[PDB]
Design a protein around this ligand. Structure first.
Ligand SMILES: Nc1ncnc2c1ncn2[C@@H]1O[C@H](COP(=O)(O)OP(=O)(O)O)[C@@H](O)[C@H]1O
Ligand SMILES: Nc1ncnc2c1ncn2[C@@H]1O[C@H](COP(=O)(O)OP(=O)(O)O)[C@@H](O)[C@H]1O
Ligand SMILES: Nc1ncnc2c1ncn2[C@@H]1O[C@H](COP(=O)(O)OP(=O)(O)O)[C@@H](O)[C@H]1O
Lengths: 372, 62, 248, 62
């Protein structure tokens, strides 16, 4: 009789309870999180809408329910299709392609899908992030990048305490929420650039995150409940393998993707850079056209490094000027040649293949494995 | 009358009180930490439910 | 009762819901922020007017709704007109004008507009800020400036947690509110003068802001919703290039 | 452990004024003596009021 008194549609509350219950209904939910959710919902019902603790509880519970619990993307396991996709998206990097095909084969033979760490160390402008994206799309697992360079606040990995209003969880929980699956392709960039300064030491958090047995029970300070990271396929990138911590260096297989000789760079530019920048500039093959000799000249006189990004800048510049010459300029179409090249990009920069070609007495050439 | 035995008879804070009391009930808790927790709960009940200090006290209590 | 029949009925008395509904009706709003706004309106309705929390909720809702959402300010595209404008308000500076014409041409060829990042570096008193203003005038996109030099705290870029007494959003939020556009022309001044000291390192926020892909979902501490910034055109001015961060 | 509290107790007994002791060690919140405005739910007066109420006098030995 006490209960049956002025129901008045229950004041429109407790609908969030059913909403969260149906949201979790599709997921395979562990017992720990399930009991936490039940107790949290009981407290929420006990509370009123205005209370700040109620708002914090709602935020935490929304974060928890938005997590993919037992939800795994339909991973691609066909090897020929993945190989074709990788070859159609990037050139060379045969070791990475073989490693990914071998990973696919073991996962298929191993039943369920798994993920292990493997770092792509090599000079910049080589295609590590791009190949990470290619792997993500070919293998069908979602993608998400993460810049750890120069980072000192470990809260980016381990989140906040969830108590201080406005506190946010670790970036990995954000990635899990966005991707909507427990088998993404996470990428950590600039691992070697960590400073781990005052109040930092995020390398310990990284060790806890990548350790194949500890990571399975990884938890952030915000969402104290642990999560399973035995299937995440992490990727790490660094131009040098020395400054990276030893405990983290020895915890992954380091794959080298290094350098692109003139012929290799020319092939890459002909088949992958020019079309990409052309589509970026809203152009077509007929209107804007470059000759292989022009690309060779750009490589050999306007760009001197193992990477490729500078060649990307030069090709983008020439395509931009072609677009200007097309929209307002007299020329409806462009046929770029070295003779014309002088006006598209300017006079050559690197006029000398070397400091000199005589090597006078007392001086000798040598080779250096610098960071870039 | 309805609030009796239901609703907001806890006032958004006695829920925390009872939850932590039951959480620590099974534990064989020392007396020092027992009185510290009692004092912390008294302070929490002495503070509002919408302030930064209240939230920090809740963090320490958890 | 007579007042309800004839008077203020549904005007500023719990009708702020409808006021903001019509205010945002023009905007092409996303859906995530739509459910967020619906939740905030439910809270405000369930919150008593007198309570300070109700007033803070109204303040936050005003801040959110005041931001444009899908409001693409019309962009000038006639290349000859913009060329004449640039040659009218500034002498020489051929490289900058050529780059701006290239940007206009690619935007026209793409159809929809887009915004990229580019820095004008040179001696002071040369016309970098003035030509940024001229570019805004010709392209017709609004203009706003931001002096990041000698600055340590990231708060003025990413505001505050909204819980601190009188917490405020980032200066970019103020710029978005003032411009009434989603694709304005932000100008970063004295980029090479950042201190990036203790509790600072705003270069991280700058990189997150200028990232060609992460910029599309930038968000601050005060407001926790992504904002698209792939069409905004940034301009950075610095007397030298060596001291600017390499990642930036 | 020198008996200063015992000295105060003996002084109170010899003076015939009621005895009470206050702990100000490490305190930061003046509310323990200033209480709280009583408008907030659960607000409690300071400790001097408790001393006056328990001693039953306006001339105790604080
Ligand atoms: N083998 C390749 N095939 C296609 N593109 C490449 C190749 N190598 C480099 N690139 C280009 O260079 C760019 C490098 O991207 P970036 O994020 O710098 O990765 P990394 O830091 O590994 O170089 C990519 O946009 C990519 O298009
Ligand atoms: N080429 C130019 N044409 C017209 N005015 C110029 C030119 N160069 C410099 N100025 C003038 O000099 C002043 C320099 O101020 P400003 O451009 O804000 O400095 P900075 O370029 O260092 O930001 C401007 O007010 C501008 O009118
Ligand atoms: N001069 C003294 N003569 C007798 N007993 C003493 C004397 N000084 C201290 N005490 C003993 O010390 C005890 C109280 O110590 P306490 O007041 O706690 O020390 P403190 O004043 O440093 O806090 C009493 O039981 C008392 O018997």
């Amino acid at each position: 009789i006490i209960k049956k008194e002025l129901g008045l549609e229950k004041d429109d509350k407790d609908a969030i309870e059913e909403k969260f219950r149906e949201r979790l209904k599709e997921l395979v939910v562990p017992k720990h999180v399930m009991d936490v959710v039940d107790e949290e919902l009981s407290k929420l019902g006990l509370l009123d809408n205005h209370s700040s603790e109620f708002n914090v509880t709602r935020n935490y519970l929304d974060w928890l329910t938005s997590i993919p619990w037992g939800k795994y993307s339909n991973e691609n396991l066909d090897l020929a299709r993945a190989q074709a996709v990788l070859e159609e998206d990037h050139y060379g990097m045969e070791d990475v392609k073989k490693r990914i095909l071998e990973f696919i084969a073991v996962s298929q033979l191993r039943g369920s899908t798994q993920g292990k760490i493997l770092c792509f160390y090599g000079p910049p402008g080589v295609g590590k992030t791009s190949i990470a994206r290619s792997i993500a799309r070919a293998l069908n697992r979602e993608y998400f990048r993460f810049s750890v360079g120069g980072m000192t606040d470990v809260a980016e990995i381990k989140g906040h305490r969830r108590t201080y209003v406005g506190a946010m969880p670790g970036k990995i929980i954000q990635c899990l929420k966005k991707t909507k699956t427990e088998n993404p392709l996470i990428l950590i960039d600039e691992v070697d650039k960590i400073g781990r300064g005052y109040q930092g030491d995020p390398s310990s958090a990284l060790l806890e995150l990548l350790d194949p047995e500890q990571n399975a029970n990884f938890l952030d300070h915000y969402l104290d409940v642990p999560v399973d990271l035995s299937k995440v396929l992490f990727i790490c990138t660094a131009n040098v393998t020395d400054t990276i911590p030893e405990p983290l260096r020895d915890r992954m297989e380091m794959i080298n993707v290094s350098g692109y000789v003139a012929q290799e760079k020319l092939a890459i530019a002909e088949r992958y850079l020019v079309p990409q920048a052309r589509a970026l500039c809203g152009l077509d093959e007929s209107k804007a056209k470059l000759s292989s000799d022009v690309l060779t000249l750009l490589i050999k006189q306007y760009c001197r490094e193992s990477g490729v990004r500078n060649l990307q800048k030069q090709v983008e510049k020439v395509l931009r000027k072609s677009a200007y010459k097309i929209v307002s300029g007299e020329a409806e179409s462009v046929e770029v040649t070295p003779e014309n090249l002088q006006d598209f990009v300017g006079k050559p920069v690197f006029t000398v293949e070397r400091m000199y070609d005589v090597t006078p007495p007392g001086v000798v050439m040598g080779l250096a494995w610098t960071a870039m």
